[PDB]
Amino acid sequence: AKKFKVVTTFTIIQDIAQNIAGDVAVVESITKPGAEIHDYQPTPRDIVKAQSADLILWNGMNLERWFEKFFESIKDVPSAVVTAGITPLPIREGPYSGIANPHAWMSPSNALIYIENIRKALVEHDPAHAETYNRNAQAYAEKIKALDAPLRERLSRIPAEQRWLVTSEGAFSYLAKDYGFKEVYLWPINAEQQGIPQQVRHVIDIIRENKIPVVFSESTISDKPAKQVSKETGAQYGGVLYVDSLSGEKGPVPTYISLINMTVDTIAKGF
Ligand SMILES: [Zn+2]
């Protein structure tokens, strides 16, 4: 009858977990494709959705500023933090300086740890299907491992001293570390915050000093600040990167694998 039901906070975790669950469990996201996830405002329908689950998965590293308060309304549903075991990169400036940068899934090596944590939770809370979760998790892990060679090759035309990744949210720190990019951003983490107009001027200074050719925005936030930086510098506006959300299932970024690939492909063509 009713399959084992997993509810995740946002769409990246939904897609990773659905690959591990296969056709044995149904995984749904609370947030919809395109919605801003850090300061999402949960609704009554979200409470009912989470309460209907057999297992709830969230990122932790205080990504979902809303989750802990929201979860107080949910009874008798186990939960698992899918970043357990990942070493955080700290936020480097701003009102959240020192807090973990939550965007750990942008490193495919970290995604292997996400996969293991989700496998572990599925096997613990749905032991009847442990054989399928284990098989699916190892197969999906191999798919993630296979991305490393083509991703590095795609970015190989960019010499080291020109590998500057200028985005809007500083959401790419884990990807930048993996592939040897220096990061510049218009704000360190999504939030209601001050200091964005001034940081735009500082980013402007860095674009000049380093001859950076391209700047980007992201799919759940406004492209206006990055477009302004591009007009106030030589740099081109390189388009929309994906980090905090997948697209719709018919969109360009329907899966976690497509998110990593499209983000790297878009950076590469921006150079
Ligand atoms: Zn973000």
CATH number of residue 110's parent domain: 3.40.50.1980
Of 129, 156, 183, the residue at which a domain comes to its end is 156
Extract the annotated binding site for Fe(2+). Answer: 38, 103, 169, 244
How far is the centre of ligand 1, averaged over its atoms, from the C-alpha of 3 (Å)? 31
b/e sequence 234-257, b meaning 16+ C-beta within 10 Å: ebebbbbbbbbbbbeeeeebbbbb
Residues 111 and 239 in one domain: no
Q: Are 163 and 249 found together in one domain? A: yes
User: Token digits for 123?
Assistant: 């096997």
Residues 84, 190, single domain; the answer is: no
Q: Could you tell me the two tokens for 121?
A: 């939770």
Residues 116, 23 share a domain = yes
Q: Of the candidates 209, 242, 202, 243, which has an alpha carbon nearest to the alpha carbon of residue 225?
A: 202
Residues 164 and 238 in one domain: yes
Neighbours of ion ligand 1 (CB under 5 A): 169, 171, 190, 244
Residues 8 and 126 in one domain: yes
Closest by CA to 241, choosing from 253, 257, 255, is 253
Tell me how many domains the chain contains: 2
Do both 16 and 110 map to the same domain? yes
End-of-domain residue from the set 135, 156, 177: 156
Give resolution, Å, one decimal.
1.7
Neighbours of 194 (CB within 10 A): 11
Integer distance in angstroms from the first to the last C-alpha of the chain?
52
| DSSP E strands, the chain | 4-8, 25-29, 55-58, 79-81, 164-169, 182-187, 214-218, 236-241
Nearest to 245 by CA among 44, 13, 18: 13
Q: What is the CA(263)–ligand 1 centre distance, in A?
A: 14
Single residue among 156, 181, 204 that ends a domain in this structure: 156
* Nearest by Cα to 74 from 56, 55, 47: 47
Question: 83 with 149, same domain?
Answer: yes
Residue 132 and residue 236 in one domain: no
Write out the residue range of the structural domain in which residue 16 sits.
4-156
